[PDB]
Symmetry: C3
Subunit: 288 residues, 3 copies
């Protein structure tokens, strides 16, 4: 008599679900910039706590999510990464096309490229993207260099959120600016308040926004188990509040979560990741 | 020439002490709601740092606790839990009855039931209780379902402090409300300021208040070694400041501390627990 | 195409450098007051991340440090501690004497005594000192009892910054006060704002200030890998901001960093230590 997230998995068939969870068990992402291997373990660790956490009726926030149906579509499986990328993109697009909400649990942040392409096909010429990450993820041979190079995507509608000047090269910042993208450095986010800054960001991304949450953006005191841990960064509460906002914002059409790395830390961090998704689900329960 | 808490153990016999420490080395508590075993190791870890920490004259707070006498009454020992519960209750009551202050170090939070019964017998019909915990601890077959069911105890004088909506079931919240108890969710505590919110709580609990501090209520960045770690929760400084307030508040007649779990983390967390007690002792030195 | 701190090591010969790094791989310091052995491992761990971290052009702070030259003078090596102390002092003084900036990475905080003596010889009768530490480091047979006993040093120009009343004995506080030194307890630093409080401190220390940063002063949620971990203390961001201020303050003539202990924690903490130095270097790039 204390129903949790697991209780919401009552959609017999995928098409019944409001929210579809897709796993992407591949390392590729920040490991390429000196990050630790292990993000491929992210989906299993997330699922472990997914089955254990999250009051469906939350009397602190006074949100009852009990009427939502969730569905777990399992992991994308492939013999090569290219093939994994293609299946992920196709799967995400299919969810978007029938009007359900895909939540992709990674896995490294390179999942965000196929995810963005699924967005661009689902909402032709009318997509916005926010990359919540300590890095810009646009460096040459990354997920967002690919998308900014897309002909159909307007960089005015791309936001880099909670990026850190100590971790981001000047050429990469210039690349974003020159494509009309927006840089909301961590210190700005802090000065404005994380929720308030994110509201600003959703104002810029507009319709059909892809909410891309790289957990590398959280401070390692709260979130140690990630591929590229940060000394400073978003707090667990900021992350939770940001996910709640995203959930209640009708223009957010999908979400992914990258760089959860249980080989770095396996207990506290996957709980934070599930609680982030939980807050999203609560926000989503309030959508008109 | 730097006297610490250990120096205050100068009461040759228990009855000489202002504050009596009682250990309760039993797991039973949050381990029952998916928490890790190990809280029974709490008292020994606490004692380890008790002998090492805490300037008796603190020039930052300008409180000199050097005139207090502390006494360590050892651990409650028993062949069964029921028997352990009976001895704890009897021991706590005896301390209360002669007007000394019992501080009980656990151990899981089920110690709080026998502790509450010792209160109800010591101050017939005139007890208040605050449960500082992320959980409500009232779920059916918990420490406080027992006490709220007590005929002599008025629920108007029961406060759930820093509880977390994500961890607390709706039926349990309803149970507390229906018994006239008060829910001060973590986000409220934060909005008011922890010390300010606790002042409000002591206003509600009134005379003969039992200050029950479950360390599960602290955020795991500061307090990882507990049976049911929290992503968000009270900071170490908030906890310290709250314990100081409790110490200086003349209506607080006893204190317990539950869910310290050295098997989860054995270094930082027992230090925090001792520093919490330390701050209590400093506050207590200021009592009229 | 993302140059970092390692790129600034372009001084072929030491005398070319603006900033000279000196390692001091010796435990002696807080280990003597119940701290863990291992600080001697500090310099190697620092160097590991020194070669990996820190965008030289930081667009968040809008500071380009690319015109600075750094030089790593290696470790002080000796068969005894006294001899190590003598070589460190002599080496630091030589750097100061030719007008370069010595940054000493420890190692335990006893390095600060030889460092202070190098200051007193470089700027006869005109030195200021700030000890950022949770402890006062003046207890009888420490680095600063030695310096306060110096005939040529005015205690009015000595500040104890972010010291903690729970860790500091009353006699030691009295020792500092009686020598006209200043105590800026952690709670004061917090109330003022760390940067603002440090500005006040630099006002008191005045010309030729020795910025001594004991990492024991940081809270262990952010900085666990130190010899004497703290429950409460400076955040990583406060530490970073303080180092930036020190870097841009023309009166700060040298810096040391003590008690980094990779045997306590080897991943997150050395990164914080390098990021502290990084922020110093950024501030220093702005000096007139």
């Amino acid at each position: 008599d204390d129903p949790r997230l697991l209780s919401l998995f009552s959609a017999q068939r995928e098409e019944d679900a409001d929210i579809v969870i897709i796993g992407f068990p591949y390392d590729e992402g920040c490991v390429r910039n000196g990050g630790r291997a292990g993000a491929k373990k992210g989906p299993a660790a997330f699922r472990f706590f997914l089955q254990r956490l999250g009051s469906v009726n939350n009397l602190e926030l006074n949100v009852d999510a009990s009427h939502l149906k969730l569905y777990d579509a399992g992991d994308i499986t492939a013999s090569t990464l290219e093939e994994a990328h293609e299946k992920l993109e196709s799967k995400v697009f299919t969810v978007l096309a029938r009007g359900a909400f895909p939540f992709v649990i990674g896995g490294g942040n390179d999942q965000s490229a196929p995810n963005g392409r699924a967005m661009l096909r689902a909402f032709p010429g009318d997509v916005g993207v926010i990359n919540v990450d300590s890095h810009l993820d646009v460096r040459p041979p990354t997920p967002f260099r690919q998308l900014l190079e897309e002909s159909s995507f307007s960089g005015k509608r791309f936001v880099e959120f909670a990026c850190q000047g100590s971790q981001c090269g000047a050429l990469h910042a210039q690349y974003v600016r020159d494509h009309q993208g927006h840089l909301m450095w961590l210190s700005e986010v802090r000065k404005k308040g994380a929720v308030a800054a994110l509201e600003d960001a959703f104002g810029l991304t507009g319709k059909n926004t892809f909410f891309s949450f790289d957990v590398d953006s959280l401070k390692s005191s709260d979130m140690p188990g990630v591929s590229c841990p940060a000394a400073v960064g978003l707090s667990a509460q900021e992350a939770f509040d940001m996910c709640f906002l995203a959930g209640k914002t009708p223009t957010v059409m999908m979400m992914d979560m990258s760089e959860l790395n249980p080989l770095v830390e396996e207990y506290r961090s996957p709980r934070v990741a599930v609680y982030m998704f939980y807050h999203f689900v609560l926000g989503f329960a309030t959508r008109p």
